[PDB]
Design a protein around this ligand. Structure first.
Ligand SMILES: CC(C)S[C@@H]1O[C@H](CO)[C@H](O)[C@H](O)[C@H]1O
Ligand SMILES: [Mg+2]
Ligand code: NA
Ligand code: NA
Lengths: 210, 211
């Protein structure tokens, strides 16, 4: 048995003065997650590019918790559909960071991608990154994953550029609101909103304000 | 460069002066044919350098100009730097080659409109409000020529002034121009009348465009 005591007002409320209905409760999902003792505790995915975006390096930093062991490995594999496009495997132990060494509990994988299919709101090309924590011999401990969009966002010479091109933001602010369920969101309502947005020539959304 | 007394009068009465080198090659095709040619650098240099040597002590002169309507050539960049080196006390401006080249401290277009872009290839005349905020652009904008006062004209003059007052980096301009270039001719009874292009048997000519 779980018991949850939810307070409507807190010191947190002082930072939650958004122009919206003031409600309370357990309004998003509750779940149980089982992880092994030796586990992926964090991972960051970066994509960097050459000048014409014909070449990319996918860089994945992976952190583990649990007992450090020589036989431990991380494999990051990148998939375009059912085709594996790149893969990197390494033991734990980051590069030297300072006078006390580096992160023994971290590893960075670098995968080369030639002619990456680029992500944008116009063509949302996605790859699948799979982060496998495993033994040298190939026994899986656990896998985490995410969708990867190859794109560069930067400001240059006073312009916001996506993949080297200046954006024109056709945006809208969107609160999480349902007339019957209040501030509880479901997949159907989210999908309805996105379809309507794109159908009406929107390409951008601001999570106002959270 | 003007008659020397002009600067004395501007010093004393109080007018800001743009002193301008006697260099205009408007009729060349393309406009920079001579100004990009190193063989014409000696002749151009003397029209700039000798102006500076004559007029550099006049307080009324606040800005030097490399001339007018001669495109943009490497000779302009050379003479721009010469002035910057010799007299740091005065900005240098020049309109040719699109009004915002490397030979000018001031965005100085001629007849750029307030709100309307005129996107000519190679040498566009942007809306002045738009010109200021072009990516990477930081310079002040002062029109070297605007509000062409030919005959019944100066329509839309207030639109410039509203813009000049609203935008800090829009710092005004020079109306084109002060005085009609009409000449006196006389009828059979000796009565004077105002003549323009073509009235002296001059041909080809550009008719009333001198006024
Ligand atoms: C007619 C344009 C193509 S050139 C135009 O002619 C004007 C006529 O008064 C002025 O001389 C301007 O300086 C010039 O830009
Ligand atoms: Mg508010
Ligand atoms: Na101004
Ligand atoms: Na004229």
């Amino acid at each position: 048995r779980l018991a949850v005591m939810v307070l409507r007002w807190s010191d947190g409320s002082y930072l939650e003065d958004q122009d919206m209905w003031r409600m309370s409760g357990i309004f998003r999902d509750v779940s149980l997650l089982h992880k092994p003792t030796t586990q992926i505790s964090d991972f960051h995915v970066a994509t960097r590019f050459n000048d014409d975006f014909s070449r990319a390096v996918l860089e994945a930093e992976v952190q583990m918790c649990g007992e450090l062991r020589d036989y431990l490995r991380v494999t990051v594999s990148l998939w375009q559909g059912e085709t594996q496009v790149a893969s990197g495997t390494a033991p734990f132990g980051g590069e030297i960071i300072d006078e006390r060494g580096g992160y023994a509990d971290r590893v960075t994988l670098r995968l080369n991608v030639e002619n990456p299919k680029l992500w944008s709101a116009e063509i949302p090309n996605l790859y699948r990154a799979v982060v496998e924590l495993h033994t040298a011999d190939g026994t899986l401990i656990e896998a985490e994953a995410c969708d990867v969009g190859f794109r560069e966002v930067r400001i240059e010479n006073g312009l916001l550029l996506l993949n080297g091109k200046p954006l024109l933001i056709r945006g809208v602010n969107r609160h999480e609101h349902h007339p019957l369920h209040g501030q509880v969101m479901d997949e159907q309502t989210m999908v309805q909103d996105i379809l309507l947005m794109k159908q009406n020539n929107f390409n951008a959304v601001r999570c106002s304000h959270y | 460069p003007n008659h020397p007394l002009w600067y004395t009068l501007c010093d004393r009465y109080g007018l800001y002066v743009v002193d301008e080198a006697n260099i205009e090659t408007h009729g060349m095709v393309p406009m920079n044919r001579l100004t990009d040619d190193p063989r014409w650098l000696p002749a151009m240099s003397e029209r700039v350098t000798r102006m500076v040597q004559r007029d550099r002590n006049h307080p009324s002169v606040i800005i030097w100009s490399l001339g007018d309507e001669s495109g943009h050539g490497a000779n302009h960049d050379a003479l721009y730097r010469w002035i910057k080196s010799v007299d740091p006390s005065r900005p240098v401006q020049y309109e040719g080659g699109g009004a915002d080249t490397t030979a000018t401290d001031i965005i100085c277009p001629m007849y750029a409109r307030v709100d309307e872009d005129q996107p000519f290839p190679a040498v566009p005349k942007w809306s002045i409000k738009k010109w200021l905020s072009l990516p990477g652009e930081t310079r002040p904008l002062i029109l070297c020529e605007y509000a062409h006062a030919m005959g019944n004209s100066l329509g839309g003059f207030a639109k410039y002034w509203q813009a000049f007052r609203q935008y800090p980096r829009l710092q005004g301009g020079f109306v084109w121009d002060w005085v009609d270039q009409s000449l006196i001719k006389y009828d059979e009874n000796g009565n004077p009348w105002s003549a323009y292009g073509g009235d002296f048997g001059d041909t080809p000519n550009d008719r009333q465009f001198c006024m």
